[PDB]
C-alpha cells in the first residue's frame, strides 16, 4: 500500500527568559523514528526506531545541524509574528510546522505538503501543485510575497519530490521487517448489562498496525449508527494501535448485531457476533 514520511515541529515562546521550547518528531507511516527536544541534555537529533540506528555519524551530525536551523527559524518567526499581529511580549505563543511526502504502492511520489500554523490557526501552506501558497490572512500574504520573490517554493518542491521520496524508500528498505509488515487487529466482543432491559455490546480491535481501521455495527445485516459509540484510535504504547466501537441493544436481541472490521492486515473484512 501507500507510505509516508512526515516531520512535525512545535515551538512555544517563553516570554520571561530565554529561547522557545522546541520539539521535532519524524515519522514513517505510523512509526516515530527520530526526535529532538530543546529541553533534553544531548542537543542532538536522537533515534527512536532501531532501523534508523543503521545510519552513521555523518547522518546524525547533518540532521542535528538541520534541526537546530529549524529551531532558529521558528525562534525568529515567533518574534516576526508577534510584530505582524501587534501582540505584546507578555504572552506565550506557538508555531507549528508539518511537512512530508506520500508515495503509492509503487513507492513513487504521490503528494507533498508543507504547512504552518500560528497559535493553532492556519497561517500559510504550500498548495498541492507545490508551486504556490495558500495564505490565510494579510500577515500570511506578506509572507507569501516574500517567499514568491525568493523562490522558496522551488527549493521545497525539489526536496518533497526528490530527497523526501528517496530517503523514505531508503527507510522502508532498512526497516522492512517492521515497516513493511502489517499487524492484523486482534478482535473480541464484550457484554455489559445496564439494567434488566438494556445491554451494551463492545467490539474490540487490538494490537494492529498501521493505525487506519474501520469498525462498524450492523443490525440484521444493515448499518447501525444510532446508539453507538466509537472511540478515537489510540496508541497501545508498543507501536501498535487500539480501537473499540459499542452499541446499546435490547436485552435478548444481541444475536441481531454484528461487528465488522476492515484493516489492511486482513484480506477479507472480519465479522464478529455475541
Amino acid at each position: 500500500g501507500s507510505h509516508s514520511m512526515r516531520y512535525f515541529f512545535t515551538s512555544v515562546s517563553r516570554p520571561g527568559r530565554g529561547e522557545p521550547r522546541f520539539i521535532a518528531v519524524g515519522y514513517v507511516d505510523d512509526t516515530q523514528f527520530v526526535r529532538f527536544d530543546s529541553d533534553a541534555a544531548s542537543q542532538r537529533m536522537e533515534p527512536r526506531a532501531p532501523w534508523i540506528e543503521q545510519e552513521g555519524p555523518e547522518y546524525w551530525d547533518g540532521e542535528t545541524r538541520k534541526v537546530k536551523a529549524h529551531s532558529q527559524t521558528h525562534r525568529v518567526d515567533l518574534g516576526t509574528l508577534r510584530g505582524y499581529y501587534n501582540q505584546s511580549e507578555a504572552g506565550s505563543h506557538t508555531v507549528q510546522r508539518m511537512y512530508g511526502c506520500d508515495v503509492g504502492s509503487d513507492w513513487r511520489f504521490l503528494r507533498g505538503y508543507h504547512q504552518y500554523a500560528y497559535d493553532g490557526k492556519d497561517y500559510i501552506a504550500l498548495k498541492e501543485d507545490l508551486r504556490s501558497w495558500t495564505a490565510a490572512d494579510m500577515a500570511a500574504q506578506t509572507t507569501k510575497h516574500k517567499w514568491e520573490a525568493a523562490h522558496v517554493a522551488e527549493q521545497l518542491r525539489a526536496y518533497l519530490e526528490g530527497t523526501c521520496v528517496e530517503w523514505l524508500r531508503r527507510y522502508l528498505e532498512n526497516g522492512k521487517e517492521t515497516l513493511q509488515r502489517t499487524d492484523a487487529p486482534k478482535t473480541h466482543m464484550t457484554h455489559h448489562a445496564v439494567s434488566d432491559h438494556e445491554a451494551t455490546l463492545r467490539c474490540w480491535a487490538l494490537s494492529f498496525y498501521p493505525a487506519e481501521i474501520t469498525l462498524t455495527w450492523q443490525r440484521d445485516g444493515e448499518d447501525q449508527t444510532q446508539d453507538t459509540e466509537l472511540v478515537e484510535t489510540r496508541p497501545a504504547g508498543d507501536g501498535t494501535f487500539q480501537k473499540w466501537v459499542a452499541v446499546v441493544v435490547p436485552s435478548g436481541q444481541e444475536q441481531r448485531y454484528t461487528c465488522h472490521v476492515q484493516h489492511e492486515g486482513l484480506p477479507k473484512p472480519l465479522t464478529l457476533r455475541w
Binding site: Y7, H70, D77, T80, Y116, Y123, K146, Q155
Partner: peptide, 9 residues
C-alpha cells in the same frame, strides 16, 4: 532526512 533550508516568515 530533514529539508536543508527553512525560510523565515
Amino acid at each position: 532526512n530533514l529539508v536543508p533550508v527553512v525560510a523565515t516568515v
